[PDB]
């Protein structure tokens, strides 16, 4: 079995070489360069609308591409579609199993995908000839529970399941086309790139990975966290991404230089992070902590610049719209709130 | 108001949507929901097959008894980490727990020096002392008893428990096992553990579950009115 320990030492020496080459290309921290700019004073954001009607915890919320309609998922088995401007509801799609943990909105506004604990992704059609909403597709090829799913296109969808794997499917044929493996823990969050050619996924053991959908292999890996990964979001530019965690610490990684840049940690927070989202210009990094309120962490200064404390329970989802006009937050108190 | 013609028709649709949401919300809120837990071969299949049944991943079993609708969630096919998806079961009435008495001289697979009974005890300790299930009662079942007696009369109980002074017969041994299982409860002033020995007839098991659920409902109603 000398081949085994030989390969172990080979892998360890390769990792040491990678670490030394990674740290060698670093000359100055990002905080040192961004020391001659004026930070934002105070981001005072007040609530505008209060979307009510849910009767259980809220686990998923997504914005449409038209910045007007949103989709929400809850434990009572409903998939209500909200109109953000007039607070009216547009659909009340029911679900087969009332155990859901993710939801998505198609970029064309035709279909809506939803996962859950039954390791099955259901895709509903909203533009049928009749007046109801039918189940267009039902993808079932995962063993572990689904945690997140994103519409790469109107015909392709990429999901990240609980059995340490991700899958890129084809809706019309019903079978998966590509399978991304390599994580040793439960993949519980992924994010697609703005150009929708690469994506990132954070495992359950202090690790994130960058995959390409064409070749289907891992290009780079990022580490530095201690507890685990809980939420990831790309930078609007597409060359960096912010990664949350549970040990009251979020970080910013770069894709071109596979090394950590900044970390946004405070000694007054000992609670985990559930959702991480950027701004329209990539200057305000909204983070949702499970201590009954959110934060408006600055991106380039790592200094808190606002608190959206208008919530009653743990915030489970938050999302900025496409044009950056407002942000939506959904917590476990069955109340969505719009901030502008 | 200042709304247009077809804008007021959209507000009428939202009202009917909210009405249908509220009507369905008061129908699924008057039925009891309960979780089911246990080891691999703790007779969970035997329990779900024995009790009344009308109905990969989570499996839900719906039945009725004495004008009460019981839903039973069997999270047995979830091989993922239990820490991540457990907070989804925070709101639940009871947690059925299946334990096998005859599974105490049967050593685990893929190992030879760790006992299955101690594994079940550790799992019960992990479940009862969770930060989410700090207010929900626990119903505990001892499934196999005839095999347990036949094994304890041929093989002493000292194999699993190293400190035991009683005789090697079923009666005091069952009480000793029950006392050892009930002592693994740190929150001894907020939740109660209802222990039962599973029999061959359906009626006794269903009646015990119904009585436990009724007691939990009465306690919750007394806690609601600030009267207890």
């Amino acid at each position, epitope marked *: 079995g000398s081949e085994l320990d030989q390969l172990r030492q080979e892998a360890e020496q390769l990792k040491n070489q990678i670490r030394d080459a990674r740290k060698a290309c670093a000359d100055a921290t990002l905080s040192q360069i961004t020391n001659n700019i004026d930070p934002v004073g105070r981001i005072q954001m007040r609530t505008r609308r209060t979307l009510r009607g849910h009767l259980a915890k809220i686990y998923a919320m997504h914005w449409g591409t038209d910045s*007007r*309609l949103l989709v929400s998922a809850s434990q009572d088995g409903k998939l209500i579609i909200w*109109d953000s401007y007039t607070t*009216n509801k*547009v659909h009340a799609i029911p679900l087969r199993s009332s155990w859901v943990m993710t939801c998505a909105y198609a970029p064309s506004g035709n279909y809506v995908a939803c996962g859950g604990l039954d390791n099955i992704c259901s895709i509903y059609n909203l533009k049928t*000839r*009749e*007046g*109801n909403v039918r189940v267009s597709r039902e993808l079932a090829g995962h063993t572990g529970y689904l945690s997140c799913c994103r519409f790469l296109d109107d015909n392709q969808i990429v999901t990240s399941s609980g059995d340490t794997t991700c899958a890129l499917w084809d809706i019309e044929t019903g079978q998966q086309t590509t399978t991304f493996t390599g994580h040793t823990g439960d993949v519980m969050s992924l994010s697609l790139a703005p150009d929708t050619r690469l994506f990132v996924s954070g495992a359950c053991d202090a690790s994130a990975k960058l995959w390409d959908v064409r070749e289907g292999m891992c290009r780079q890996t990022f580490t530095g966290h201690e507890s685990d990964i809980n939420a990831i979001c790309f930078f609007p530019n597409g060359n960096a991404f912010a990664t949350g965690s549970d040990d009251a610490t979020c970080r910013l990684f770069d894709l071109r230089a596979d090394q950590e840049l900044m970390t946004y940690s405070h000694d007054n927070i000992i609670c985990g992070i559930t959702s991480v989202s950027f701004s329209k210009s990539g200057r305000l990094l909204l983070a949702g902590y499970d201590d009954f309120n959110c934060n408006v962490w600055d991106a380039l200064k790592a200094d808190r610049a606002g608190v959206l404390a208008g919530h009653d329970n743990r915030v489970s989802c938050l999302g900025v719209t496409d044009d950056g006009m407002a942000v939506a937050t959904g917590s476990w108190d069955s109340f969505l709130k719009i901030w502008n | 108001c*200042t709304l*247009s*013609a*077809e*804008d007021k*028709a*959209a507000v*009428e*649709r939202s009202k*009917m949507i909210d009405r249908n949401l509220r009507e369905d919300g008061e129908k699924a809120a008057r039925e009891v929901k309960l979780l089911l837990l246990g080891a691999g071969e703790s007779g969970k299949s035997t329990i779900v097959k024995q009790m009344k049944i009308i109905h990969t991943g989570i499996v839900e079993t719906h039945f009725t008894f004495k004008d009460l609708h019981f839903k039973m969630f069997d999270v047995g096919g979830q091989r993922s980490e239990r820490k991540k998806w457990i907070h989804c079961f925070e709101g639940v009435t009871a947690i059925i727990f299946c334990v096998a008495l005859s599974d105490y001289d049967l050593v685990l697979a893929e190992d030879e020096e760790m006992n299955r009974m101690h594994e079940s005890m550790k799992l019960f300790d992990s479940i009862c002392n969770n930060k989410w299930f700090t207010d929900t009662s626990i119903i505990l079942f001892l499934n196999k008893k005839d095999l347990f007696e036949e094994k304890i009369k041929k093989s002493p109980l000292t194999i699993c428990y190293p400190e035991y002074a009683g005789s090697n017969t079923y009666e005091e041994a069952a009480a000793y096992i029950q006392c050892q299982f009930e002592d693994l409860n740190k929150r001894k002033d907020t939740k109660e553990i209802y222990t039962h020995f599973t029999c061959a007839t359906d009626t006794k098991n269903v009646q015990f579950v119904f009585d436990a659920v009724t007691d939990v409902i009465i306690k919750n109603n007394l806690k609601d009115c600030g009267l207890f």
Partner: single-chain antibody
Amino acid sequence: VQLVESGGGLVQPGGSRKLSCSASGFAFSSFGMHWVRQAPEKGLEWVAYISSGSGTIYYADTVKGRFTISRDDPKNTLFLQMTSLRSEDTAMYYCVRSIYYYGSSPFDFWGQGTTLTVSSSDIVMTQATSSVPVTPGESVSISCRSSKSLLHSNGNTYLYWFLQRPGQSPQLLIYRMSNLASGVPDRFSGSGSGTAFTLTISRLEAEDVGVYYCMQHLEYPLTFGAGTKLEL
């Protein structure tokens, strides 16, 4: 999707029968219904409307308090009851479905209609020309003028266009002001300013010829136009 109507024939004044329309192919319980009259060799006009769930009902002031509308969801039927009819009610009747939500297209499926023969302020929409001779292969522009600004504070107008071929019921072309309906080819286009609107066709075929109607939906007293005949 199918809507078939019945209950028409020869009726003397003083009393009349009931018109029954049955639907099959969609969710009838979530669709509002409209009744549309169509006088012979004349223009078509609105009659009555009932909302989803029979919550809100509207009648035309010409037959206000004289006609009655009703639904039946268990059998998905619609009934129109007329107490007494004059000699001016002999016309064709259509039962149209429409659902109202953000992004919907009302007046999508008209139906077939039934005839009825009897033996013997509001916005004014005016069509530009009654009839236009056009040979195939020519871009044609039809204009419809209104008596008030249909543009609302929200940002969208409420002027719909319908095309009626000889021998069958009309169909929707472009809902609201310019968005194209489903199933209609991309040759049709629409535009406007707020008072006078236009509909343009790039190339005209032998299958696209008939009468064009413009309708306003700003207020519940809906009204149509006189009609622009398109000839070969």
